[PDB]
Amino acid sequence: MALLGTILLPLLGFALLGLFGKRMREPLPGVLASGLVLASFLLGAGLLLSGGARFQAEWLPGIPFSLLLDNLSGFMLLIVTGVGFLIHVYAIGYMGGDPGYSRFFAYFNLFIAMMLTLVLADSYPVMFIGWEGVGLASFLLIGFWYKNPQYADSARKAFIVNRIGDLGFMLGMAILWALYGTLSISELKEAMEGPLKNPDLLALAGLLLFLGAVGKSAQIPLMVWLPDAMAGPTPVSALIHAATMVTAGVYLIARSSFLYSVLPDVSYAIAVVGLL
Amino acid sequence: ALFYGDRGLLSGYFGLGGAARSLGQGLARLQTGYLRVYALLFVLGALLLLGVMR
Amino acid sequence: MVVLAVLLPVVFGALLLLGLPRALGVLGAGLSFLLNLYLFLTHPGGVAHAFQAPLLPGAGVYWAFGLDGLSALFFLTIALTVFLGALVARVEGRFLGLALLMEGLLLGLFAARDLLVFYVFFEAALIPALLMLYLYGGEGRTRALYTFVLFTLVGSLPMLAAVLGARLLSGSPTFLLEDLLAHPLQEEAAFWVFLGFALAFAIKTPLFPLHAWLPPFHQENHPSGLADALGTLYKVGVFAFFRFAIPLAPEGFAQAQGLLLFLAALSALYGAWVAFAAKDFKTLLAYAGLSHMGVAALGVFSGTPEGAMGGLYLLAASGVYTGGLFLLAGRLYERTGTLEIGRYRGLAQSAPGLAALALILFLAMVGLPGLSGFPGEFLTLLGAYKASPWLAALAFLSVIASAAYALTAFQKTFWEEGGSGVKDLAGAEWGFALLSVLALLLMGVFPGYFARGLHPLAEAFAKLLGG
Amino acid sequence: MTLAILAVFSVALTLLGFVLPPQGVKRATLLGLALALASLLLTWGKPFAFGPYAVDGVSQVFTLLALLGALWTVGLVRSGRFEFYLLVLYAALGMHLLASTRHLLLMLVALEALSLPLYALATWRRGQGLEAALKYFLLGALAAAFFLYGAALFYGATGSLVLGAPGEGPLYALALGLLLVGLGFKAALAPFHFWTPDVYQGSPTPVVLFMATSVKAAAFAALLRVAAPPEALALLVALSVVVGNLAALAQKEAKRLLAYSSIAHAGYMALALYTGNAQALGFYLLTYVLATGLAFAVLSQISPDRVPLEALRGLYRKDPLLGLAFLVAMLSLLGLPPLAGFWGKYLAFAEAARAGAWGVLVLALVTSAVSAYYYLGLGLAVFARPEETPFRPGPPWARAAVVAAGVLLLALGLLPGLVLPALAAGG
């Protein structure tokens, strides 16, 4: 329950700054956002220092709600929380005289909570939840200044490519559900060891997972959507290109290393695409 | 193109309904009002019935 | 018991129709909502509120009702959606009584525990549709009315021969679903019965070749879209498929499974694709509803209880948020006067939370995780991939077009250059949007709580296709 | 002991019209019909037969319906010719005798006795009335000649002129066909349907009411005694319903369209003949009589000579209750829930499926779905913009009659298990 607070803080923050939002002074939304990010960095460092964390809640039959905090997840968590606190301060300074301050920092809080939902996941559907939440927050922030139509179609293209990647993700997950029936990365790893079965289907699922990763991290051919993210403010572009929404492409492969390692050809293809 | 095709499919449904009305007025044309016509068609239908009974 | 909640919207709609005032509909829909929620809680099982009364002893007709896991949450969904449409309506033509009557009719339709009462409600649901269509709006009202009504009736009337064959050829003494399920139909006889069922249920699903009645229906209703919301609730086809069509004649469904899955896939794709080409809100929302019905029918037809539970959950939730979008388009009409997508761009700056409401609704439409659409969408994907991967993959070249059309409409309606300026929100619309977002979040983030009654029916009727 | 009441009233009135004004004669006819109806009801569950006259549930129900139709059509007839009432009485008595015997020859005498006064009542002297009367009389005498040769070949296949005999092969089938010709003509079944549109269009509207209710009722009452083979029944149903609905699609006038619709409805009623249930058919005809008498009472309030479809429009604004009852009638004849037409239609289709005729039933259902086009184009026209049209908003007489008809239709549609328990011997 305590681990869920890391996500819940920049959700209550988002709700305050979105619903009421403009009932506050100008710095206060950024203040609340950066304070929640800091007290989430703190609670993540404290939970990791306690050895690790696990959380499981009731969900769809066969697909429960599983959060796992280990070294690999805590790495991304600390990175995102720290850089997010820094960029939140840089936005408090950088955002000035433009309306939507509260809305802007609510988008920030939502982005942070969704990225946390992504990294803290023992089940792939929770990873997909984080995927689509980050995509939505990106669509929103890229089109922050809505009064210009030009900086709307950029986020349109971004979310469309994102949903192509998400469809590949969904199909790979349906594959690794028809085969095994677990879809929880813990038991998925404990079940993928030993006598692999139908290696063609496994390589296909991994290839679709890599397709989703390409759209998320803007690899070839889906490269083109990333430059248009210039439409959004500079701190938005920073958070999108450095700490989040692209690093998830690498994190998916890091967690699915057990799958990609028994796929030599798929991994060689990943290397070729990375070089290109 | 799929929008135009959907419009065309609805047009084909329309054509089905129009075929129904045209068939209807061809059958309503059967009654002209000349009593000889009604008597002939009556006896014709009755003979068809009597043949069917076997 | 069940009959009380089934009849409450009927009697309230009567008291609004002949009696006064409009306000009676708001409080009536609220009482219905509370009663349907109370029935949704403490639900032990199917027999929860069982009702059995004789009507035609000799012919075999009985009022037969009961709350299955399906009947409970569909009662709750209908009550909620119609209450929202009752407060926000702004039609105020004094015909919200017709909306409550249709609500009660759909309730009796879902709660039917015997075949003939289900058939009776299926045929009765036609009258209010043509009524609120004809005298309460639309330029091509007569032609769209004839099209929709004739399609439904050409499907429905042969289904009477189908049900008469299903009862008589099985030697079932009654029309009770219990008894009828107790006596199976034979090969090349369940074939014809299922064919007569599949026509009437596909033309109302709707599937691809039989959807031509949907856009004209949605265009010429009252511009507020209350009639449109209730017609979207009138896509009960899938339900009748899962409970009645397949279990009563799986022998024909054996040959028809691939065909129906293909139809569902192409229908979903076609709807979500054409919705991009839509130049008005009614066309877009009609094609979107077609896509969602294709997805639901796919999930049910795939066997694979995953797919079936997904299809039903997606059906209920899609009814909810599509009715919400319809009412929203109607309110934006009443404050503006047009449903065109190109015009009236500046909305977002003038509409503070109406933008957020429309956004939440479109997100639930495209099936965003955390909102109501994604559980059904993904469970249906899993079940379909279990059944046939190819049609599931093709069918899910839909989320792409979903995002495309939804984002295009949202952007060019709200985001772009400021226009004249538009009213912010009405007082009733405040509760409308609040409750909309509440229900959407609760059904999307907590799909565990809802649909628990759907799992037993799903796995049982899916294993039924086996030995 | 109801037929005695009818005979006494008719024979006494025949002379009393010389001393009584036609209005007093009208009051007398109305009293006689109400007394006969009450005597029928007090005998409910008391079958009574003296000679070839035999009263069962069929006689009881169908004569009740015929008496209802006669009362309703007499209410509107206000001409100062007491003969214009006497004839009505005859038809009732005549139709009574038609449903009250199995004797084929007494069946012929009853048919002639109920039909002849209709020929004379159809004379408002409008030039179309003459043409209608001529077609009617000639085709009816042709059908009577066919029916008589059929009764003769029946006597040839069996020593008695009473139905139910064992029956031979080709000769019995042939006699059955020669009877079915006349009986379907009287019931307006195709391909004997030609006379019905012209006659309904030409005759004065209230007379068309009386016809389209009581004549069809008694015709099916007589059909129920016949053991019509399934092939003949299927052909009649197919042709009748198809032509009925299709030719009704092309109709521009309300009365002709309604005549073709009644051809289609006789086609539907011809399903209960599969089993001769006499419960399904009794229920169907109850609902049909009520709805059609209602519709034609409204049309008579509009115009006796001829009523186009546009005249129906704006009726709700003109008279709300009238438009509502007309909508009820159009839907009940469409056989749509929760109206009793659905229950009558279902009972006929259940009899048909129990007999095992499937494709015929499917074709009937498709034609009934096609019928919805004009059924709605009539029912929904009530709400349209009122165009130029004569409108006579009736006396309280016809208003109350129409209201009672619609109320009974909806009441028995919503809870059919009220009277349907007593359509057999009458518990």
Coordinates of N, CA and C in Angstrom, one line a residue, chain A residues 84-213:
Chain A
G84 N 12.7 15.0 -12.6 CA 11.3 15.6 -12.6 C 11.2 16.7 -11.6
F85 N 11.8 16.5 -10.4 CA 11.9 17.6 -9.5 C 12.7 18.8 -10.0
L86 N 13.8 18.5 -10.7 CA 14.6 19.6 -11.2 C 13.9 20.3 -12.4
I87 N 13.2 19.6 -13.3 CA 12.5 20.2 -14.3 C 11.2 20.9 -13.8
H88 N 10.7 20.4 -12.7 CA 9.5 21.1 -12.1 C 9.9 22.4 -11.5
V89 N 11.1 22.5 -10.9 CA 11.6 23.8 -10.5 C 11.9 24.7 -11.7
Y90 N 12.5 24.1 -12.7 CA 12.8 24.8 -14.0 C 11.6 25.3 -14.7
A91 N 10.5 24.6 -14.5 CA 9.2 25.0 -15.1 C 8.6 26.1 -14.2
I92 N 8.6 26.0 -12.9 CA 8.2 27.0 -12.0 C 8.8 28.4 -12.4
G93 N 10.1 28.3 -12.6 CA 10.8 29.5 -13.1 C 10.4 29.8 -14.6
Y94 N 10.4 28.8 -15.4 CA 10.3 29.0 -16.9 C 8.9 29.3 -17.3
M95 N 7.9 28.8 -16.6 CA 6.5 29.1 -16.9 C 6.2 30.4 -16.2
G96 N 5.8 31.4 -16.9 CA 5.5 32.7 -16.4 C 4.6 33.5 -17.3
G97 N 3.6 34.1 -16.7 CA 2.6 34.9 -17.5 C 1.8 34.2 -18.5
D98 N 1.9 32.9 -18.6 CA 1.1 32.2 -19.5 C 0.0 31.4 -18.8
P99 N -1.2 31.5 -19.1 CA -2.3 30.8 -18.4 C -2.1 29.3 -18.5
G100 N -2.8 28.6 -17.6 CA -2.7 27.1 -17.6 C -1.5 26.6 -16.7
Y101 N -1.0 27.5 -15.8 CA 0.0 27.1 -14.9 C -0.4 25.8 -14.1
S102 N -1.6 25.9 -13.5 CA -2.1 24.7 -12.8 C -2.3 23.6 -13.7
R103 N -2.9 23.8 -14.9 CA -3.1 22.8 -15.9 C -1.8 22.2 -16.3
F104 N -0.8 23.0 -16.5 CA 0.6 22.6 -16.9 C 1.2 21.6 -15.9
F105 N 1.2 22.0 -14.6 CA 1.8 21.2 -13.6 C 0.9 20.0 -13.2
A106 N -0.4 20.0 -13.5 CA -1.2 18.8 -13.4 C -0.8 17.8 -14.5
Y107 N -0.6 18.3 -15.7 CA 0.0 17.5 -16.7 C 1.3 16.8 -16.3
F108 N 2.2 17.7 -15.6 CA 3.4 17.1 -15.1 C 3.2 16.0 -14.1
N109 N 2.4 16.3 -13.1 CA 2.1 15.3 -12.1 C 1.6 14.0 -12.7
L110 N 0.6 14.1 -13.6 CA 0.0 12.9 -14.3 C 1.1 12.2 -15.1
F111 N 2.0 12.9 -15.8 CA 3.0 12.3 -16.5 C 3.9 11.4 -15.6
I112 N 4.3 12.0 -14.4 CA 5.2 11.4 -13.5 C 4.5 10.1 -12.9
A113 N 3.2 10.2 -12.5 CA 2.5 9.1 -12.0 C 2.4 8.0 -13.0
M114 N 2.1 8.3 -14.2 CA 2.0 7.3 -15.3 C 3.3 6.6 -15.6
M115 N 4.4 7.4 -15.6 CA 5.7 6.8 -15.8 C 6.1 5.8 -14.7
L116 N 5.7 6.2 -13.5 CA 5.9 5.3 -12.3 C 5.0 4.0 -12.5
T117 N 3.8 4.2 -12.9 CA 3.0 3.0 -13.2 C 3.6 2.1 -14.2
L118 N 4.3 2.7 -15.2 CA 5.0 1.9 -16.2 C 6.1 1.1 -15.6
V119 N 7.0 1.8 -14.9 CA 8.2 1.1 -14.4 C 7.9 0.1 -13.3
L120 N 7.0 0.5 -12.4 CA 6.6 -0.4 -11.3 C 5.5 -1.3 -11.8
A121 N 5.9 -2.4 -12.4 CA 4.9 -3.3 -13.0 C 5.5 -4.8 -13.0
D122 N 4.7 -5.7 -12.4 CA 5.0 -7.1 -12.5 C 4.1 -7.8 -13.5
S123 N 3.2 -7.0 -14.1 CA 2.3 -7.5 -15.1 C 2.3 -6.6 -16.3
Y124 N 2.4 -7.2 -17.5 CA 2.5 -6.4 -18.8 C 1.3 -5.5 -19.0
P125 N 0.1 -5.8 -18.7 CA -1.0 -4.9 -18.9 C -0.8 -3.6 -18.1
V126 N -0.2 -3.6 -16.9 CA 0.1 -2.4 -16.1 C 1.2 -1.6 -16.9
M127 N 2.1 -2.3 -17.5 CA 3.1 -1.6 -18.4 C 2.4 -0.9 -19.5
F128 N 1.3 -1.5 -20.1 CA 0.6 -0.9 -21.1 C -0.2 0.3 -20.6
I129 N -0.8 0.2 -19.4 CA -1.5 1.3 -18.8 C -0.5 2.5 -18.7
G130 N 0.7 2.3 -18.2 CA 1.7 3.4 -18.2 C 2.0 3.9 -19.6
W131 N 2.1 3.0 -20.5 CA 2.4 3.4 -21.9 C 1.4 4.4 -22.4
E132 N 0.1 4.0 -22.4 CA -1.0 4.9 -22.9 C -1.1 6.1 -22.1
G133 N -0.9 6.1 -20.7 CA -1.0 7.3 -19.9 C 0.1 8.3 -20.3
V134 N 1.3 7.8 -20.5 CA 2.4 8.7 -20.9 C 2.1 9.2 -22.3
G135 N 1.5 8.4 -23.2 CA 1.1 8.9 -24.5 C 0.1 10.0 -24.5
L136 N -0.9 9.8 -23.6 CA -2.0 10.9 -23.5 C -1.4 12.1 -22.9
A137 N -0.6 12.0 -21.8 CA 0.0 13.2 -21.2 C 0.9 13.9 -22.2
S138 N 1.6 13.2 -23.1 CA 2.4 13.8 -24.1 C 1.6 14.5 -25.2
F139 N 0.5 13.9 -25.6 CA -0.4 14.5 -26.5 C -0.9 15.9 -25.9
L140 N -1.2 15.8 -24.6 CA -1.8 17.0 -23.9 C -0.7 18.1 -23.9
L141 N 0.5 17.8 -23.4 CA 1.5 18.9 -23.2 C 2.0 19.4 -24.5
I142 N 2.2 18.6 -25.5 CA 2.7 19.0 -26.8 C 1.7 20.1 -27.4
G143 N 0.4 19.9 -27.2 CA -0.6 20.8 -27.6 C -1.0 21.7 -26.4
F144 N -0.1 22.1 -25.6 CA -0.4 23.0 -24.4 C -1.0 24.3 -24.9
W145 N -0.3 25.0 -25.8 CA -0.8 26.2 -26.4 C -1.7 25.8 -27.5
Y146 N -3.0 25.7 -27.1 CA -4.0 25.1 -28.1 C -4.3 26.2 -29.1
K147 N -4.3 27.5 -28.8 CA -4.7 28.5 -29.7 C -4.0 28.5 -31.0
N148 N -3.0 27.7 -31.1 CA -2.3 27.5 -32.4 C -2.7 26.2 -33.0
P149 N -3.3 26.1 -34.1 CA -3.6 24.7 -34.7 C -2.3 24.0 -35.1
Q150 N -1.3 24.6 -35.4 CA 0.0 24.0 -35.8 C 0.5 23.1 -34.7
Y151 N 0.5 23.5 -33.5 CA 1.0 22.7 -32.4 C -0.1 21.9 -31.8
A152 N -0.9 21.3 -32.7 CA -1.9 20.3 -32.3 C -1.7 19.0 -33.1
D153 N -1.5 19.2 -34.4 CA -1.3 18.0 -35.3 C 0.0 17.3 -34.9
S154 N 1.0 17.9 -34.3 CA 2.2 17.3 -33.8 C 1.8 16.2 -32.8
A155 N 1.1 16.6 -31.8 CA 0.6 15.6 -30.8 C -0.3 14.6 -31.4
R156 N -1.1 15.0 -32.3 CA -2.0 14.0 -33.1 C -1.1 12.9 -33.6
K157 N -0.1 13.3 -34.4 CA 0.8 12.3 -35.0 C 1.5 11.5 -34.0
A158 N 1.9 12.1 -32.9 CA 2.6 11.4 -31.8 C 1.7 10.3 -31.2
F159 N 0.5 10.7 -30.9 CA -0.4 9.7 -30.3 C -0.8 8.6 -31.3
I160 N -0.9 8.9 -32.6 CA -1.2 7.9 -33.6 C -0.1 6.9 -33.7
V161 N 1.1 7.3 -33.8 CA 2.3 6.4 -33.8 C 2.3 5.7 -32.5
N162 N 2.0 6.3 -31.4 CA 2.0 5.7 -30.1 C 1.0 4.5 -30.1
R163 N -0.2 4.7 -30.7 CA -1.2 3.7 -30.7 C -0.9 2.6 -31.7
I164 N -0.1 2.8 -32.8 CA 0.4 1.7 -33.6 C 1.3 0.9 -32.7
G165 N 2.2 1.5 -32.0 CA 3.1 0.8 -31.1 C 2.3 0.0 -30.0
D166 N 1.3 0.6 -29.5 CA 0.4 0.0 -28.5 C -0.3 -1.2 -29.0
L167 N -0.7 -1.1 -30.3 CA -1.4 -2.3 -30.9 C -0.4 -3.4 -31.0
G168 N 0.8 -3.2 -31.5 CA 1.8 -4.2 -31.5 C 2.1 -4.8 -30.1
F169 N 2.1 -3.9 -29.1 CA 2.2 -4.4 -27.7 C 1.1 -5.3 -27.3
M170 N -0.1 -4.9 -27.6 CA -1.3 -5.7 -27.3 C -1.3 -7.1 -28.0
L171 N -0.8 -7.1 -29.2 CA -0.8 -8.4 -29.9 C 0.3 -9.3 -29.4
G172 N 1.4 -8.8 -29.1 CA 2.5 -9.6 -28.4 C 2.0 -10.1 -27.1
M173 N 1.2 -9.3 -26.3 CA 0.7 -9.7 -25.0 C -0.3 -10.8 -25.2
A174 N -1.2 -10.7 -26.2 CA -2.2 -11.8 -26.5 C -1.4 -13.0 -26.8
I175 N -0.3 -12.9 -27.5 CA 0.5 -14.1 -27.8 C 1.0 -14.8 -26.6
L176 N 1.7 -14.0 -25.7 CA 2.3 -14.5 -24.5 C 1.2 -14.8 -23.5
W177 N 0.0 -14.6 -23.8 CA -1.1 -15.1 -23.0 C -1.7 -16.4 -23.5
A178 N -1.9 -16.5 -24.8 CA -2.3 -17.7 -25.4 C -1.4 -18.9 -25.2
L179 N -0.1 -18.6 -25.2 CA 0.9 -19.6 -25.0 C 0.9 -20.1 -23.5
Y180 N 1.2 -19.2 -22.6 CA 1.4 -19.6 -21.2 C 0.2 -19.4 -20.3
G181 N -0.4 -18.2 -20.4 CA -1.5 -17.9 -19.5 C -1.2 -17.1 -18.3
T182 N 0.0 -16.6 -18.1 CA 0.4 -15.9 -16.9 C 0.4 -14.4 -17.1
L183 N 1.1 -13.9 -18.1 CA 1.2 -12.4 -18.4 C 1.7 -11.6 -17.2
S184 N 2.3 -12.2 -16.2 CA 3.0 -11.5 -15.1 C 4.5 -11.7 -15.2
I185 N 5.3 -10.7 -15.4 CA 6.7 -10.8 -15.7 C 7.4 -11.7 -14.8
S186 N 7.0 -11.8 -13.5 CA 7.6 -12.7 -12.6 C 7.4 -14.1 -13.0
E187 N 6.1 -14.5 -13.0 CA 5.8 -15.9 -13.4 C 6.0 -16.1 -14.9
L188 N 6.0 -15.0 -15.7 CA 6.3 -15.2 -17.1 C 7.8 -15.6 -17.2
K189 N 8.7 -15.0 -16.4 CA 10.1 -15.5 -16.5 C 10.2 -16.9 -15.9
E190 N 9.6 -17.2 -14.8 CA 9.7 -18.5 -14.2 C 9.1 -19.6 -15.1
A191 N 8.2 -19.2 -16.1 CA 7.6 -20.1 -17.0 C 8.4 -20.2 -18.3
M192 N 9.1 -19.2 -18.7 CA 9.8 -19.2 -20.0 C 11.1 -19.9 -19.9
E193 N 11.6 -20.3 -18.7 CA 12.8 -21.0 -18.5 C 12.6 -22.5 -18.9
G194 N 13.7 -23.1 -19.4 CA 13.6 -24.5 -19.7 C 13.3 -24.9 -21.1
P195 N 12.4 -25.9 -21.3 CA 12.0 -26.3 -22.6 C 11.1 -25.3 -23.3
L196 N 11.6 -24.3 -24.0 CA 10.8 -23.4 -24.7 C 9.9 -24.2 -25.7
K197 N 8.8 -23.6 -26.0 CA 7.8 -24.2 -26.9 C 7.4 -23.2 -28.0
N198 N 7.2 -23.7 -29.2 CA 6.9 -22.9 -30.4 C 7.8 -21.7 -30.4
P199 N 9.1 -21.8 -30.7 CA 10.0 -20.7 -30.8 C 9.6 -19.6 -31.8
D200 N 8.9 -20.0 -32.9 CA 8.4 -19.1 -33.9 C 7.4 -18.1 -33.2
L201 N 6.5 -18.6 -32.5 CA 5.5 -17.7 -31.8 C 6.2 -16.8 -30.8
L202 N 7.2 -17.3 -30.1 CA 7.9 -16.5 -29.1 C 8.6 -15.4 -29.8
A203 N 9.3 -15.7 -30.9 CA 10.1 -14.6 -31.6 C 9.1 -13.6 -32.2
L204 N 7.9 -14.1 -32.6 CA 6.9 -13.2 -33.1 C 6.4 -12.2 -32.0
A205 N 6.1 -12.7 -30.8 CA 5.7 -11.9 -29.7 C 6.8 -10.9 -29.4
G206 N 8.1 -11.3 -29.4 CA 9.2 -10.4 -29.1 C 9.3 -9.3 -30.2
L207 N 9.1 -9.7 -31.4 CA 9.2 -8.7 -32.5 C 8.1 -7.7 -32.4
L208 N 6.9 -8.1 -32.0 CA 5.8 -7.1 -31.8 C 6.1 -6.2 -30.6
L209 N 6.7 -6.8 -29.5 CA 7.1 -6.0 -28.4 C 8.1 -4.9 -28.8
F210 N 9.1 -5.3 -29.7 CA 10.1 -4.4 -30.2 C 9.4 -3.4 -31.1
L211 N 8.4 -3.7 -31.8 CA 7.6 -2.8 -32.6 C 7.0 -1.7 -31.7
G212 N 6.4 -2.1 -30.6 CA 5.9 -1.1 -29.7 C 7.0 -0.2 -29.1
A213 N 8.1 -0.9 -28.8 CA 9.3 -0.1 -28.3 C 9.8 0.9 -29.3

